[model samples]
Structures are given as structure tokens and as C-alpha cells.
Target: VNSFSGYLKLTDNVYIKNADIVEEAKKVKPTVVVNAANVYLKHGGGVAGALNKATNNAMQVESDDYIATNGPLKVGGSCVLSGHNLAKHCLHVVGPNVNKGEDIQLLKSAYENFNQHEVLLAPLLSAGIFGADPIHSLRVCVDTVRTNVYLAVFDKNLYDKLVSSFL
Candidate 1:
């Protein structure tokens, strides 16, 4: 149930990136910078790189090095690394959704590129029981379940801030 890159199509439960996540904080110059890092269904680089690390997949550059040097703090999801750098705490959202939809394919591609090691990473994310159309189904579900779904998109500048906060 996928489409190729050359065609246009619709998706269910899209993973929107917070491209402004970086810039918004920049404008505020916040004493603290909090970010929820996740791979989005958009065109970008850093999120893919982070996903590569999280998934233990291959990268064009030293993604492993990035994880080793700048990772271990997940964002946009439920995981957190409790620390003092209020400006740098990251909230990584894991996915069953693909930034490219074909990101799953890209994962396969990256695996093939990385010498075909099987089962590279942990879980993936997607909107379960929540279809496309209404963007806040999950939010409503969370509210019903008494959870906080502060849905934030991915932004590169914000990602840079997330990286710089503690790196």
C-alpha cells in the first residue's frame, strides 16, 4: 500500500515536521530550548540523519558519530533524558510513519547500502486507530486517555538548537 516518488498521493496519519521548531525558539531566544525530534513526512535531511541513528541504519555521513556525540536523548515521543540543560532537553517522536512514505523503503535502501544487516533498530511510529483527515484524532484520544498530545512539528533550525543545547 505505497506509491513511488514520481507520483502524488495522500497518506494516513501524516507525520508533520516542525521546521519552525528551530526558528520559533530562535525568535524567542528562550533561556530553555525544548524540542520533540521526529522524522516527518516532509523533505529534509537532519531528521533522516537522526532516524538513521535511532534505527541503527546507515548514513551518508557519520550518523553513528552524531548519536555517540550528540544523541541518547530522544524527543517528540515519550522518552526523555532528565538533565539540567533546560535549553537542551529533547523529546523525540518515534514512528511507524515515513517522512517520505518510502522512508521505509529508504530504510531498506539504507540497509542494503549498509551491507544488509538485519533488524537494525527498535520500534517505529504511525497514527494507530487514527486515520488521516482530522489532524487531532490522536490528540482527542490522548485527552480521553488523559495524556498530553502537544503535537509539534519538526523544524531544522529547532533541531540545530536541540543539538546545540547540550552538544
Candidate 2:
């Protein structure tokens, strides 16, 4: 049985859940998958770290190129790059500390501005290593995504809450 099986609706085509993100991406073949990359593109921890390890550093090289040319990525800034084994494209954004309104705005900008694809897979920015509330971050994502969106989750409690709320 899947540890994360249910999806909570945020909007007409947006959803949230607690599941393995990469596995979900594989199932959907989303036109683009999102990664929370630090300014350095180190890909050292959290979701990016796991995803970089899974894809054999394909995300690292691409993100490095964007950082090299564009300088350090600002909060809420995003760069689209090629995915190795994950999706057709990878949208890399700098995760932010959620305390500031600007940071949250930046996160929303990254989510709302992406328009080249039909399907998007993203996690809640600032909620993991960056330390933000998952529910609020998810709401931001829900408000911004214009197309089909799938949010991966791993927390049993959060999943239960979302399921209960939706049901």
C-alpha cells in the first residue's frame, strides 16, 4: 500500500498530498518539475539534495549554469533547466525563509509566473529546510498555479489533515 495515497484539492486542477515526489513525477511525466535550489546550486539538502542524488547530478549541472550566468538567484526567482531522469524540464527556485512577506511573495511569483508547460510538480517552498508552514505554503501554490499541479507530501499528519479537510 502507498504511504501517501490521497490528494487534497486546492483548486480546480491543483492538489496536495504526502507522497514521494519523484515517484509521483515519474507517474505523471509532468512537463516540468520544481526544485528548491539554493543560491549556490549546491543541491546539498532537502528535496533538491534527494532529487539531485536520484537524477545523477543532472539537475546540478543545469542549475550551476544558470547560477553562473545569472549570478545568485534571488528569493522567488526561478530558472528553467533540463531534467535528467525526472521530467522534461526542471524549474529551480531559491527556497526562502517564510517569515517575511517578500519571501512568500517571491515563492508565489515563481509559482505564478511559470507558463510554458501544462503540468507542474512542486513541493511547498520554505516548509522543509527553509522552515515554513506547510499549509500556508500550499495555499500559496494553490493560488498561483494556472494549470494542473501536483504537490508531493510525506507527512502522515499533514496528509491526514488534508484528507479530512477535503472529505
Candidate 3:
């Protein structure tokens, strides 16, 4: 079975889940999913690279072309990657490079921008490579949006731990 948490109800329309976001995407078939892209859209590394692999590098090509035409994407700015498996469209947000102990407002901004969908798959924004606490990021994501939010988790053991905390 696809690994997933029993959704933690955060609000009437909002719930939090820890699962394989892309796999969950195929199941939910949301209209949009959020991408944690850097300023450039090369998708050479991180979650962007993983998403690129899932979509046959479509995300990279689309994001790259969009960046080329529109210039570098900044924090809170978003672009769409069309015709991907997770969703008919992917909402790529260029979140800030937040180091540890810095302000986390940009992460909140990224979630605010991603709040337009009925079901949106996203990571813990600015938490992993960017150094924000995953738990705090989850709270930020939940507080900012009313839509269903699926937080991707790479480890099953950790997923269990986080799920309990949210529950």
C-alpha cells in the first residue's frame, strides 16, 4: 500500500500528511503541485532534481524556459510546469536560501503563494537544505493555506515520528 499518514486535520479544509508527494499526486491528481525550485530552474539537485526525474525532466525544461524569458525568479514568485504526472500543472516557487537561525518569512511566503489549489503537494519549505526546522515549516505551511497539503517524507521511521507529533 502507498505509505501515508491518517491526515492530521488542521482546519475545515486543511489537513497535513506525510507521504511520497509525487505518488500521492498520481492518486489525487491535483490540478497543481508546488515545486521548491531555486532561482534557476535547471533542477540539477535537491527536490527539484527529484521532481525532474519523476516528470521526465519536463519540469526543468519548462522552468528553465520560463526563467529565461522572465528572468530570475525570486522568493514568493511562482511559475507553472504543465503536463506532469503528479498534476496537470506544477506550480514552481523559487523559495529563499535560508540558512540556520535566519528569518523564515520567505518560507511562509512560499506557502502563501502555493495556497491556490484544492490539493497541493509540497515539501517542508526551507527545512531540509535551507535549514529551517521541519516541524516549524509544517506549522507555517498549515497556517498559511486552507487547501489539502501533502508533505513528502523520505523516511518511513521519521514519518511515523512526525505523524504522532501532528496527531
Candidate 4:
């Protein structure tokens, strides 16, 4: 069965265009791609786009993927990934920090404008991007999104805990 939380809901169109974001995603294209909007805000400018062109570039991708996100990458930002099982994956990016932006609203817009199957991944409490603790990172990489999700981290104990959460 698909392991997802009740809070998770999929809209019609969303995607990520990079593979390095997730190792499993690197080997296999994503149906929906989750990206770091914070990264774009920190970098991505002048000669480069809001997101690293090599890492965040989703354009002309199929409109049926469940793109995930934590916030808008920029004025014109979106997600996209393509591969064999791509059509069945759901990309879950968390909403913007508790402080600002209407990231969640973007998904609603996507739902109204796109044509495709979709599912929502729960809103993560903390993602390491903010120097958040392990549990926080774990929240960002919650397992309810699916049976198995690939997260690349330097903490082995945290990894074990994440795997154990599903057990």
C-alpha cells in the first residue's frame, strides 16, 4: 500500500528537474521533484537563475507529476523529473518557513491549472537547511510520503532512526 499521511494530498502538476537533490532520484528520474527554495534565495542570480541551473531547472517537463516544495524558488520557479516510474512518484517539498511566503498556495494554484494525478506529502517540521536538529531533519524527510524514500545524510544514527520509524 502507499504509505502516506492523511495531511498529504496530491495536486495535478508539479515537478523538479534535478537529480542531485536526492541520490535515489539521481539514479532514477522523479515523477515529482522536491527542491530547496532557500538555496535559490541564497544563491541563483546575475549570470545564474534563482536555482542552480544544474540542480534546479524544471521546464517543459510533463504536467502530470506531483512536484514537492518548501517555498517558491523564485518569480518563475517549478519542478520536473522524468523516468520509468516517474509517473508514479510524488514530490513533497515543505511549505515556507513559519515566518513568510505562501508556498502552500502555489500547490493549490498548480492543482487548479495542471492536469495529472497528485498526492500531498505532510508538511515537515524541520529541514537541516536551517541547522535544524536531527528530529527536525527527519521531519523534513518523513517516511509517510511513501514506503521508502532515499535521504542522504552524514549522521548514521539519524539514518537508522529514520529507517526504524517505519518499522
True-structure lDDT of candidate 4? 0.32
TM-score of each: 0.29, 0.82, 0.82, 0.36
* Number of clashing residue pairs, candidate 4: 15
Global CA lDDT computed for model 2: 0.72
Error of 3 at 50 (Å): 0.9
Estimate the overall C-alpha local distance difference test score of candidate 1: 0.28
* Local distance difference test scores for all models: 0.28, 0.72, 0.69, 0.32
lDDT of 2 by residue, 60-133 (tens): 88777877888887776677788778888888777576544445656676666455567777777767777777
Q: What are the C-alpha RMSDs, in order, of all predicted structures?
A: 16.3, 3.9, 3.4, 10.4
What residue runs in model 3 are displaced by over 4 Å at the alpha carbon?
A: 1-6, 100-102
Candidate 1 local lDDT, 1-167, one digit each (tens): 32111211112221222333333333333232222233322213343333333323433233335456665422222332221222133333333244324233222221121112111111112332111212232232222222112223343463344334321
* Stretches of candidate 2 exceeding 4 Å from the true structure: 1-8, 99-102, 165-167
